[PDB]
Amino acid sequence: APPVSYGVEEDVFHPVRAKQGMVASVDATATQVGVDILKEGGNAVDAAVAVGYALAVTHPQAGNLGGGGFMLIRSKNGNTTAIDFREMAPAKATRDMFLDDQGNPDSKKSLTSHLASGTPGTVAGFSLALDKYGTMPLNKVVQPAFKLARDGFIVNDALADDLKTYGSEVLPNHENSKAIFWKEGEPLKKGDTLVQANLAKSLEMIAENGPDEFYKGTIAEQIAQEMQKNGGLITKEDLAAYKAVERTPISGDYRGYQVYSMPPPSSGGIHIVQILNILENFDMKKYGFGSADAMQIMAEAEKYAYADRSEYLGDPDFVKVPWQALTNKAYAKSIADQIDINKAKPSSEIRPGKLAPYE
Amino acid sequence: TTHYSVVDKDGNAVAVTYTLNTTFGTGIVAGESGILLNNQMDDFSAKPGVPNVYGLVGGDANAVGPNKRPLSSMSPTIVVKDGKTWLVTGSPGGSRIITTVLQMVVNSIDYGLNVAEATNAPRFHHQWLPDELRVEKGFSPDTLKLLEAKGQKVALKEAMGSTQSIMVGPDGELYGASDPRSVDDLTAGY
Numbered sequence: 420a421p422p423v424s425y426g427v428e429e430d431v432f433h434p435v436r437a438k439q440g441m442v443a444s445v446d447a448t449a450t451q452v453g454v455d456i457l458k459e460g461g462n463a464v465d466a467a468v469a470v471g472y473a474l475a476v477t478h479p480q481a482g483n484l485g486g487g488g489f490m491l492i493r494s495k496n497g498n499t500t501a502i503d504f505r506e507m508a509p510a511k512a513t514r515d516m517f518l519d520d521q522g523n524p525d526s527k528k529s530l531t532s533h534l535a536s537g538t539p540g541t542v543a544g545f546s547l548a549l550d551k552y553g554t555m556p557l558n559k560v561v562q563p564a565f566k567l568a569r570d571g572f573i574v575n576d577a578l579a580d581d582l583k584t585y586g587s588e589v590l591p592n593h594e595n596s597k598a599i600f601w602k603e604g605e606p607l608k609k610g611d612t613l614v615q616a617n618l619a620k621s622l623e624m625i626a627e628n629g630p631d632e633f634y635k636g637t638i639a640e641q642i643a644q645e646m647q648k649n650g651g652l653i654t655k656e657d658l659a660a661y662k663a664v665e666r667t668p669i670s671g672d673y674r675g676y677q678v679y680s681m682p683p684p685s686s687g688g689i690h691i692v693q694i695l696n697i698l699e700n701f702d703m704k705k706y707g708f709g710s711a712d713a714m715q716i717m718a719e720a721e722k723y724a725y726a727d728r729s730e731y732l733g734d735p736d737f738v739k740v741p742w743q744a745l746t747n748k749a750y751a752k753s754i755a756d757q758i759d760i761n762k763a764k765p766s767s768e769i770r771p772g773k774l775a776p777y778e
Numbered sequence: 779t780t781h782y783s784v785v786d787k788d789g790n791a792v793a794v795t796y797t798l799n800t801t802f803g804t805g806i807v808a809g810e811s812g813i814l815l816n817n818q819m820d821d822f823s824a825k826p827g828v829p830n831v832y833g834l835v836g837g838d839a840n841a842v843g844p845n846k847r848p849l850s851s852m853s854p855t856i857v858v859k860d861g862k863t864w865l866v867t868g869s870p871g872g873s874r875i876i877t878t879v880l881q882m883v884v885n886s887i888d889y890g891l892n893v894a895e896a897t898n899a900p901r902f903h904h905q906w907l908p909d910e911l912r913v914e915k916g917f918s919p920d921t922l923k924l925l926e927a928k929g930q931k932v933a934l935k936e937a938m939g940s941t942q943s944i945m946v947g948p949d950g951e952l953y954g955a956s957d958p959r960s961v962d963d964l965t966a967g968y
């Protein structure tokens with residue numbers, strides 16, 4: 420690999436610079452919340468949790484308390500770990516629950532019905548991380564988000580546009596949702612103030628009673644009732660049984676750099692490492708960014724990875740994922756040897772790889 | 779989905795990617811809690827061979843099952859250089875998360891681009907099925923011509939992802955970049 424560049428005056432694009440702490444997020448308000456937490460003495464995990472709660476208020480498009488995700492943590496001392504707070508399917512979920520009477524998947528059931536939801540893990544994940552790797556109490560990192568929900572914030576271009584474009588397809592179709600995000604028959608517009616009193620109460624109760632409020636308390640009750648009254652599956656038992664799980668990160672080595680990412684239930688870490696393993700066999704620097712050859716090589720490598728993804732990836736607590744084989748450099752080499760820089764291989768000629776010789 | 783990165787004064791780093799799945803998820807708020815509910819169940823394979831909203835397919839491994847966690851593509855990632863945390867990144871994008879993050883890593887290591895340059899650079903993507911080499915605007919017509927000649931099925935589509943990254947200098951200086959693809963985003967420090 421060639422020398423790295425942190426950026427110089429002659430560049431077209433300049434990074435933001437800081438000497439102490441830094442936060443990068445999709446929302447200015449949330450980013451500022453994180454920076455303020457750092458300035459107050461919180462560590463990276465404290466700030467990360469604060470940002471997560473703030474986005475649950477200022478970026479309802481994706482920030483959330485009702486969804487799930489993953490967290491990668493690396494201490495100054497090198498300790499690297501992954502937090503899995505991915506939703507768990509309800510205990511009553513079944514293999515063919517999304518098939519219609521003809522046996523064909525119904526995307527409406529898996530995307531817009533009450534059956535589309537998995538038991539939320541965000542609150543559990545943030546507390547697992549805060550309790551073990553943070554330094555501040557939950558009420559402290561939740562407070563910023565609480566105030567934003569209670570006192571409100573100004574709707575910007577991003578939120579106004581998303582409410583109009585994506586929100587219009589689902590938000591006005593549910594009374595409680597419409598009461599919060601719609602106004603005078605239309606989605607909130609830029610400049611409007613969005614106050615979320617109910618979310619503020621939920622945040623206040625979580626700050627006061629801990630994550631148990633979400634999984635066993637009033638919030639759990641509200642979720643269970645929402646499901647029970649509208650054909651949903653999440654029950655109080657599902658919520659009480661949810662657990663975030665600390666897992667070993669998936670990692671690899673690319674030209675002397677070590678890459679750490681998410682392990683199953685995510686496919687991200689495995690395929691990023693697998694693809695990098697494949698690319699390592701080529702002089703990528705020589706081809707350069709935006710070159711037909713570099714793009715050809717990567718597009719081809721990506722094909723094999725996604726083919727493998729469709730067959731070998733799943734929740735590790737339910738299926739044995741051959742992660743060792745998938746991230747094996749010899750396996751990657753066998754793939755790289757199939758890449759013709761002058762001729763792409765149709766996906767129809769690509770199937771999940773035979774991992775036996777690498778296990 | 780949304781991703782954010784954090785690095786503190788002590789050198790600790792955190793990368794978080796979380797989501798409701800699609801924008802606003804189901805669009806359903808849970809009673810009087812004010813909490814929107816996810817539609818993450820679509821990440822399971824509903825039936826072998828049938829693609830989900832991101833064009834991803836599966837079989838037994840990712841089939842729906844009680845208490846099971848649906849397969850994700852989320853990739854909060856940290857790259858280490860000379861034994862030290864060097865790049866903290868991640869991004870939303872469903873199936874495209876893998877390739878978006880991959881490009882951030884390749885741009886940084888192979889092409890020597892600073893974090894902002896790597897962030898603002900155009901992206902391409904191929905996920906096996908469908909068989910198409912998806913690209914954003916930004917690539918040379920000459921280059922796309924060569925790719926099509928190689929047999930790639932180039933398809934110009936909408937912007938992909940929203941990387942929020944931080945590169946750490948060996949001296950402790952922090953360099954950050956928010957994706958231009960997301961209006962109102964921000965990377966700041968002190």
Ligand SMILES: *C(=O)CC[C@H](N)C(=O)O
Binds near residue numbers: 779851873
């Ligand atoms: C947003 O990019 C989420 C994509 C999907 N739900 C998953 O990979 O988890």
